[PDB]
Amino acid sequence: FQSMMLDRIRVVLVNTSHPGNIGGAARAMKNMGLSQLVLVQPESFPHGDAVARASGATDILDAARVVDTLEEALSGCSVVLGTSARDRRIPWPLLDPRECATTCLEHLEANGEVALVFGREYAGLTNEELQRCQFHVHIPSDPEFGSLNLAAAVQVLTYEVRMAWLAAQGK
Amino acid sequence: NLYFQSMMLDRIRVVLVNTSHPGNIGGAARAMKNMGLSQLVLVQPESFPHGDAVARASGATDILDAARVVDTLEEALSGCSVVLGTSARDRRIPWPLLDPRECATTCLEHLEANGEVALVFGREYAGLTNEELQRCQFHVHIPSDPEFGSLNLAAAVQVLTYEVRMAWLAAQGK
């Protein structure tokens, strides 16, 4: 039942450009106990580079749901949290990954379904896409430098989820 | 002081031991750069320099250009005051086994003491040898699913460097 809670976190990758990042995201999810991958218009999928980077997490790629729109990806979700490479200081406040993990686990209560949405490598999420997320998540990084790699960003968020999930069990 | 605090991350050395995939070296460089680190050391990398490393090091090729390549872990650790190495879920008594959050706390205690920190990462699946692990004062384990517990090397560097940045930000009240 504790492990099954993590099955209800849907990782949504929006219009991923590099197939290697899809595999890297699948590996990061598998390493943390997550399994539900959804791809919105992936540029190149399936692809040998996604299999290669998955390094054993090919099961996640095999069960991945490929959809045309973010709206279809989010169907049935209780709450949606998004992370994008483009996030200007206008509309909403940003959660850090630790607070994102807390939000995720509380929303998994009572059979809740949580979506963790990741934007395109450079282009992030569009304004329309961002409006579909009730929470916006930002990984604190050096503001002088570049965005985190997509698979690295999935690893950070999922790692925080696991840490919070382990702490609740006294583990 | 404020000057001191702002420059602390230059005193963390990221040591990659015997990396097989050059792409992981570039991915590690990128992960370090986004977290404010800069000092990369490679112990017997299989293929370096290499185009695949450059390809993955977006916005971080300067880290690859300045990387120090050495024949042994002993040479990579020269001048360090503390060494923390990644390890599996089972503690090697009496070496302490820290999670990444405790690793970051230990790093910041040593950086505030004007120490030099090494974060050591093993091979893609073999990890570090018993001899390499004995050169660390601390072992670090990223809690992962025990049925699929080996992270991608660059992903592991990202997790540890992310925790170091969080602790470094907290220390400054930001």
Tab-separated table of C-alpha atoms in Angstrom:
chain	number	residue	atom	x	y	z
A	1	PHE	CA	0.000	0.000	0.000
A	2	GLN	CA	2.905	2.397	0.706
A	3	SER	CA	4.647	1.506	-2.521
A	4	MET	CA	1.326	1.715	-4.415
A	5	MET	CA	0.881	5.386	-3.477
A	6	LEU	CA	3.888	6.203	-5.774
A	7	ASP	CA	2.033	4.471	-8.724
A	8	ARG	CA	-0.477	7.372	-8.609
A	9	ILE	CA	2.102	10.032	-9.478
A	10	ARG	CA	1.874	10.629	-13.250
A	11	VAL	CA	5.089	12.076	-14.715
A	12	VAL	CA	4.139	14.129	-17.771
A	13	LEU	CA	6.851	15.159	-20.262
A	14	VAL	CA	5.633	17.885	-22.623
A	15	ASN	CA	6.970	17.781	-26.221
A	16	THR	CA	10.438	16.436	-25.263
A	17	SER	CA	13.044	17.218	-27.928
A	18	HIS	CA	15.905	14.814	-27.035
A	19	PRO	CA	14.824	11.111	-26.859
A	20	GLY	CA	17.696	10.439	-24.405
A	21	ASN	CA	15.885	12.731	-21.883
A	22	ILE	CA	12.756	10.520	-22.108
A	23	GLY	CA	14.863	7.451	-21.169
A	24	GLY	CA	16.726	9.420	-18.479
A	25	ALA	CA	13.401	10.535	-16.957
A	26	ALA	CA	12.144	6.878	-17.005
A	27	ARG	CA	15.358	5.726	-15.219
A	28	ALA	CA	15.085	8.538	-12.598
A	29	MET	CA	11.412	7.604	-11.906
A	30	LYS	CA	12.186	3.849	-11.640
A	31	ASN	CA	15.149	4.568	-9.196
A	32	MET	CA	12.676	6.433	-6.921
A	33	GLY	CA	9.787	3.901	-7.089
A	34	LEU	CA	7.587	5.742	-9.648
A	35	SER	CA	6.258	4.079	-12.811
A	36	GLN	CA	3.560	6.105	-14.620
A	37	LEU	CA	5.012	8.046	-17.590
A	38	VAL	CA	2.895	10.158	-20.001
A	39	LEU	CA	4.374	11.847	-23.100
A	40	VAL	CA	2.656	14.781	-24.806
A	41	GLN	CA	3.769	14.924	-28.441
A	42	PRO	CA	7.307	13.631	-27.925
A	43	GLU	CA	9.504	14.600	-30.834
A	44	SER	CA	11.203	11.167	-31.239
A	45	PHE	CA	9.538	8.228	-29.495
A	46	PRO	CA	10.104	5.338	-29.486
A	47	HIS	CA	13.820	5.745	-30.053
A	48	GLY	CA	17.033	3.807	-29.373
A	49	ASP	CA	18.485	6.716	-27.325
A	50	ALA	CA	15.453	6.601	-24.942
A	51	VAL	CA	16.024	2.810	-24.479
A	52	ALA	CA	19.758	3.357	-23.912
A	53	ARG	CA	19.310	6.036	-21.261
A	54	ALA	CA	16.586	4.075	-19.552
A	55	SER	CA	19.344	1.581	-18.507
A	56	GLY	CA	16.935	-1.134	-17.380
A	57	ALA	CA	13.805	1.060	-16.942
A	58	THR	CA	12.469	-0.022	-20.338
A	59	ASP	CA	9.349	-1.261	-18.556
A	60	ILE	CA	8.360	2.368	-17.882
A	61	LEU	CA	8.878	3.216	-21.595
A	62	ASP	CA	6.776	0.157	-22.610
A	63	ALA	CA	3.868	1.252	-20.367
A	64	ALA	CA	4.194	4.977	-21.323
A	65	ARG	CA	0.995	6.675	-22.548
A	66	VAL	CA	1.548	8.915	-25.615
A	67	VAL	CA	-1.083	11.693	-26.080
A	68	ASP	CA	-1.674	14.714	-28.283
A	69	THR	CA	-2.438	17.340	-25.639
A	70	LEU	CA	-1.602	18.228	-22.026
A	71	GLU	CA	-5.304	18.198	-21.331
A	72	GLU	CA	-5.575	14.448	-22.221
A	73	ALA	CA	-2.433	13.791	-20.163
A	74	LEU	CA	-4.041	15.361	-17.074
A	75	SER	CA	-7.462	13.655	-17.412
A	76	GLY	CA	-8.425	12.143	-14.048
A	77	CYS	CA	-5.724	13.907	-12.036
A	78	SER	CA	-6.517	15.404	-8.691
A	79	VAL	CA	-3.747	18.055	-8.697
A	80	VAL	CA	-1.115	19.202	-11.162
A	81	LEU	CA	2.322	20.643	-10.451
A	82	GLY	CA	4.487	22.022	-13.235
A	83	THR	CA	8.106	22.742	-13.735
A	84	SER	CA	9.253	24.841	-16.765
A	85	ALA	CA	12.480	26.333	-18.090
A	86	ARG	CA	10.599	29.559	-18.748
A	87	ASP	CA	8.926	30.930	-15.516
A	88	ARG	CA	8.715	34.786	-15.335
A	89	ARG	CA	7.796	36.790	-12.156
A	90	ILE	CA	4.215	37.588	-13.021
A	91	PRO	CA	1.329	35.205	-12.242
A	92	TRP	CA	2.053	32.597	-9.505
A	93	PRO	CA	4.373	31.812	-6.588
A	94	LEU	CA	6.943	28.994	-6.926
A	95	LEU	CA	7.274	25.913	-4.671
A	96	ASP	CA	10.746	24.506	-4.090
A	97	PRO	CA	11.189	20.674	-4.602
A	98	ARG	CA	10.845	19.933	-0.849
A	99	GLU	CA	7.465	21.721	-0.638
A	100	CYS	CA	6.470	20.123	-3.975
A	101	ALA	CA	7.129	16.673	-2.385
A	102	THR	CA	4.889	17.556	0.640
A	103	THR	CA	2.091	18.785	-1.699
A	104	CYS	CA	2.362	15.597	-3.818
A	105	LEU	CA	2.105	13.237	-0.817
A	106	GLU	CA	-0.820	15.085	0.778
A	107	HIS	CA	-2.670	15.006	-2.560
A	108	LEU	CA	-2.048	11.238	-2.897
A	109	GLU	CA	-4.302	10.726	0.147
A	110	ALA	CA	-7.780	9.137	-0.395
A	111	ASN	CA	-6.686	7.556	-3.721
A	112	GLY	CA	-5.698	10.963	-5.159
A	113	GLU	CA	-3.797	11.136	-8.500
A	114	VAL	CA	-0.945	13.682	-8.869
A	115	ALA	CA	0.646	14.939	-12.101
A	116	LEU	CA	4.239	16.234	-12.142
A	117	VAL	CA	4.524	18.157	-15.478
A	118	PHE	CA	7.883	18.992	-17.107
A	119	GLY	CA	8.250	21.330	-20.053
A	120	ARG	CA	10.352	21.243	-23.194
A	121	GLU	CA	14.113	21.377	-22.803
A	122	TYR	CA	14.701	25.028	-23.597
A	123	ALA	CA	11.243	26.367	-24.364
A	124	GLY	CA	9.572	25.132	-21.126
A	125	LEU	CA	5.745	25.136	-20.906
A	126	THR	CA	3.548	27.559	-22.852
A	127	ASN	CA	1.294	30.113	-21.053
A	128	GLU	CA	-1.751	27.860	-21.831
A	129	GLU	CA	0.051	24.833	-20.466
A	130	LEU	CA	1.150	26.668	-17.287
A	131	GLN	CA	-2.535	27.608	-16.636
A	132	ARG	CA	-3.323	23.903	-16.266
A	133	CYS	CA	-0.957	23.571	-13.281
A	134	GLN	CA	-2.283	24.513	-9.827
A	135	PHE	CA	1.292	24.740	-8.552
A	136	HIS	CA	4.480	25.879	-10.205
A	137	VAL	CA	7.776	24.313	-9.044
A	138	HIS	CA	11.270	25.803	-9.333
A	139	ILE	CA	14.539	24.006	-8.540
A	140	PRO	CA	16.867	26.600	-6.924
A	141	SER	CA	19.880	26.907	-9.134
A	142	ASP	CA	22.550	29.478	-10.002
A	143	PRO	CA	20.601	32.316	-11.764
A	144	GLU	CA	23.704	33.255	-13.832
A	145	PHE	CA	23.689	29.817	-15.533
A	146	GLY	CA	21.500	27.456	-17.586
A	147	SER	CA	18.432	25.362	-16.800
A	148	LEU	CA	18.789	21.852	-15.343
A	149	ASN	CA	18.733	18.973	-17.807
A	150	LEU	CA	15.167	17.575	-18.089
A	151	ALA	CA	16.048	14.063	-16.747
A	152	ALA	CA	18.106	15.717	-13.921
A	153	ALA	CA	15.042	17.881	-13.004
A	154	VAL	CA	12.813	14.749	-12.927
A	155	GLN	CA	15.486	13.092	-10.690
A	156	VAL	CA	15.495	16.021	-8.194
A	157	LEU	CA	11.672	16.174	-7.834
A	158	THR	CA	11.272	12.386	-7.574
A	159	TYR	CA	14.200	12.164	-5.094
A	160	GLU	CA	12.390	14.741	-2.845
A	161	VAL	CA	9.173	12.760	-3.136
A	162	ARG	CA	10.939	9.585	-2.062
A	163	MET	CA	12.692	11.323	0.867
A	164	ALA	CA	9.327	12.638	2.166
A	165	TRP	CA	7.633	9.228	1.553
A	166	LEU	CA	10.455	7.453	3.511
A	167	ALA	CA	10.264	10.008	6.387
A	168	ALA	CA	6.476	9.418	6.840
A	169	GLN	CA	7.209	5.660	7.367
A	170	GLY	CA	9.993	6.511	9.870
A	171	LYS	CA	12.531	5.219	7.328
B	1	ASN	CA	32.335	37.208	5.482
B	2	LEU	CA	29.630	37.691	2.921
B	3	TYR	CA	32.540	37.329	0.532
B	4	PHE	CA	33.564	34.065	2.172
B	5	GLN	CA	30.085	32.532	2.005
B	6	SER	CA	29.640	33.512	-1.666
B	7	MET	CA	32.868	31.663	-2.693
B	8	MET	CA	32.503	28.449	-0.616
B	9	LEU	CA	31.320	26.188	-3.518
B	10	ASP	CA	34.646	26.593	-5.409
B	11	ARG	CA	36.122	24.482	-2.534
B	12	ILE	CA	34.082	21.379	-3.493
B	13	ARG	CA	35.857	18.990	-5.867
B	14	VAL	CA	33.608	16.584	-7.827
B	15	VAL	CA	35.609	13.380	-8.475
B	16	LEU	CA	34.363	10.903	-11.096
B	17	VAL	CA	36.041	7.504	-10.792
B	18	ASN	CA	36.613	5.566	-13.857
B	19	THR	CA	33.569	6.826	-15.852
B	20	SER	CA	32.696	4.590	-18.847
B	21	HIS	CA	30.215	6.806	-20.786
B	22	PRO	CA	31.668	10.198	-21.836
B	23	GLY	CA	28.117	11.571	-21.974
B	24	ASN	CA	27.887	11.131	-18.161
B	25	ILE	CA	31.008	13.279	-17.702
B	26	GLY	CA	29.258	16.121	-19.642
B	27	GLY	CA	26.004	15.551	-17.743
B	28	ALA	CA	27.922	15.732	-14.406
B	29	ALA	CA	29.591	18.992	-15.565
B	30	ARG	CA	26.217	20.449	-16.381
B	31	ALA	CA	24.692	19.358	-13.012
B	32	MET	CA	27.677	20.945	-11.126
B	33	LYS	CA	27.540	24.198	-13.088
B	34	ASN	CA	23.785	24.784	-12.462
B	35	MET	CA	24.402	24.280	-8.696
B	36	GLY	CA	27.356	26.701	-8.532
B	37	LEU	CA	30.230	24.162	-8.485
B	38	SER	CA	33.185	24.277	-10.874
B	39	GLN	CA	36.003	21.888	-9.885
B	40	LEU	CA	35.822	18.578	-11.791
B	41	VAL	CA	38.433	15.805	-11.388
B	42	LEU	CA	38.445	12.595	-13.470
B	43	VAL	CA	40.223	9.429	-12.320
B	44	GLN	CA	40.977	7.224	-15.318
B	45	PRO	CA	38.036	8.259	-17.482
B	46	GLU	CA	37.523	5.830	-20.343
B	47	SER	CA	36.994	8.445	-23.055
B	48	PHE	CA	38.032	12.009	-22.305
B	49	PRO	CA	38.063	14.455	-23.968
B	50	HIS	CA	35.188	13.345	-26.136
B	51	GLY	CA	32.489	14.927	-28.278
B	52	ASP	CA	29.698	13.162	-26.290
B	53	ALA	CA	30.881	14.831	-23.124
B	54	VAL	CA	30.828	18.247	-24.791
B	55	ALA	CA	27.350	17.427	-26.238
B	56	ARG	CA	25.841	16.778	-22.769
B	57	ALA	CA	27.624	19.690	-21.011
B	58	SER	CA	25.288	22.401	-22.270
B	59	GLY	CA	26.207	25.723	-20.691
B	60	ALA	CA	29.066	23.923	-18.855
B	61	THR	CA	31.850	23.308	-21.304
B	62	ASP	CA	34.123	25.588	-19.250
B	63	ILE	CA	33.958	22.887	-16.501
B	64	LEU	CA	35.176	20.254	-19.003
B	65	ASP	CA	37.932	22.598	-20.260
B	66	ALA	CA	39.249	23.124	-16.682
B	67	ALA	CA	38.823	19.433	-15.631
B	68	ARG	CA	41.835	17.727	-14.047
B	69	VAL	CA	42.562	14.193	-15.293
B	70	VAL	CA	44.556	11.905	-12.912
B	71	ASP	CA	45.656	8.249	-12.717
B	72	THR	CA	44.613	7.515	-9.110
B	73	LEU	CA	41.979	8.462	-6.513
B	74	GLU	CA	44.868	9.352	-4.123
B	75	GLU	CA	46.040	12.098	-6.589
B	76	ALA	CA	42.415	13.338	-7.054
B	77	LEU	CA	42.055	13.748	-3.226
B	78	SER	CA	45.403	15.544	-2.637
B	79	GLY	CA	44.775	18.634	-0.474
B	80	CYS	CA	41.267	17.727	0.575
B	81	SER	CA	40.263	18.010	4.252
B	82	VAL	CA	37.200	15.739	3.900
B	83	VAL	CA	36.166	13.055	1.354
B	84	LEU	CA	32.634	11.708	0.947
B	85	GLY	CA	31.996	8.822	-1.453
B	86	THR	CA	28.801	7.357	-2.927
B	87	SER	CA	27.997	3.836	-1.761
B	88	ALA	CA	25.217	1.151	-1.707
B	89	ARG	CA	22.438	0.927	0.980
B	90	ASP	CA	24.511	-1.276	3.359
B	91	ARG	CA	26.831	0.589	5.779
B	92	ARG	CA	30.536	-0.403	5.815
B	93	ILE	CA	31.098	-0.297	9.652
B	94	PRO	CA	32.550	1.981	11.138
B	95	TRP	CA	32.310	4.421	8.152
B	96	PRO	CA	29.189	6.600	8.605
B	97	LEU	CA	26.557	6.152	5.868
B	98	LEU	CA	24.810	9.500	5.188
B	99	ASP	CA	21.806	10.320	3.057
B	100	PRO	CA	22.370	13.313	0.590
B	101	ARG	CA	20.889	15.811	3.066
B	102	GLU	CA	23.309	14.779	5.841
B	103	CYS	CA	26.124	14.777	3.221
B	104	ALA	CA	25.279	18.428	2.419
B	105	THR	CA	25.303	19.383	6.180
B	106	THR	CA	28.735	17.766	6.580
B	107	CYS	CA	30.007	19.585	3.402
B	108	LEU	CA	28.885	22.982	4.739
B	109	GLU	CA	30.475	22.343	8.188
B	110	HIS	CA	33.803	21.653	6.435
B	111	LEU	CA	33.442	24.623	4.001
B	112	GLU	CA	32.659	26.997	6.959
B	113	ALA	CA	35.851	25.615	8.641
B	114	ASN	CA	37.819	26.662	5.446
B	115	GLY	CA	38.239	23.006	4.463
B	116	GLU	CA	38.396	21.455	1.005
B	117	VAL	CA	35.686	18.916	0.185
B	118	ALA	CA	35.754	16.009	-2.289
B	119	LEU	CA	32.510	14.376	-3.449
B	120	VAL	CA	33.504	11.036	-5.001
B	121	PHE	CA	31.301	9.135	-7.461
B	122	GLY	CA	31.951	5.585	-8.564
B	123	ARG	CA	31.549	3.703	-11.846
B	124	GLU	CA	28.099	3.448	-13.630
B	125	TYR	CA	27.203	0.032	-11.903
B	126	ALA	CA	30.376	-1.273	-10.177
B	127	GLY	CA	30.474	1.806	-7.871
B	128	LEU	CA	33.701	2.329	-5.861
B	129	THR	CA	36.106	-0.507	-4.930
B	130	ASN	CA	36.637	-1.404	-1.214
B	131	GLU	CA	40.090	0.312	-1.467
B	132	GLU	CA	38.527	3.528	-2.927
B	133	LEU	CA	35.788	3.531	-0.245
B	134	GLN	CA	38.510	3.325	2.422
B	135	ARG	CA	39.884	6.720	1.238
B	136	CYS	CA	36.581	8.359	2.150
B	137	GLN	CA	35.795	9.553	5.666
B	138	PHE	CA	32.087	9.364	4.922
B	139	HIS	CA	29.886	7.188	2.659
B	140	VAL	CA	26.794	8.575	1.021
B	141	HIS	CA	23.815	6.620	-0.110
B	142	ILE	CA	21.000	8.130	-2.253
B	143	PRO	CA	17.806	6.351	-1.024
B	144	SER	CA	16.498	4.529	-4.026
B	145	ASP	CA	14.250	1.547	-4.747
B	146	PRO	CA	16.295	-1.507	-3.577
B	147	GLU	CA	15.053	-3.466	-6.645
B	148	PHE	CA	16.477	-0.800	-9.082
B	149	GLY	CA	18.892	1.202	-6.929
B	150	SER	CA	21.644	2.507	-9.256
B	151	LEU	CA	21.095	6.094	-10.444
B	152	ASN	CA	22.578	7.436	-13.652
B	153	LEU	CA	25.979	8.991	-12.764
B	154	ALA	CA	25.060	12.542	-13.862
B	155	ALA	CA	21.677	12.171	-12.012
B	156	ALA	CA	23.558	11.140	-8.812
B	157	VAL	CA	25.862	14.193	-9.157
B	158	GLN	CA	22.736	16.367	-9.601
B	159	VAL	CA	21.100	15.033	-6.390
B	160	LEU	CA	24.166	15.559	-4.173
B	161	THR	CA	25.036	19.001	-5.661
B	162	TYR	CA	21.347	20.073	-5.349
B	163	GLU	CA	21.432	19.190	-1.603
B	164	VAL	CA	24.745	21.086	-1.185
B	165	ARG	CA	23.204	24.187	-2.847
B	166	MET	CA	20.059	23.979	-0.576
B	167	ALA	CA	22.285	23.818	2.565
B	168	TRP	CA	24.529	26.631	1.225
B	169	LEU	CA	21.401	28.815	0.531
B	170	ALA	CA	19.965	28.015	4.029
B	171	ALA	CA	23.251	28.990	5.654
B	172	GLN	CA	22.928	32.390	4.130
B	173	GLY	CA	19.252	32.684	5.125
B	174	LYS	CA	18.049	32.530	1.457
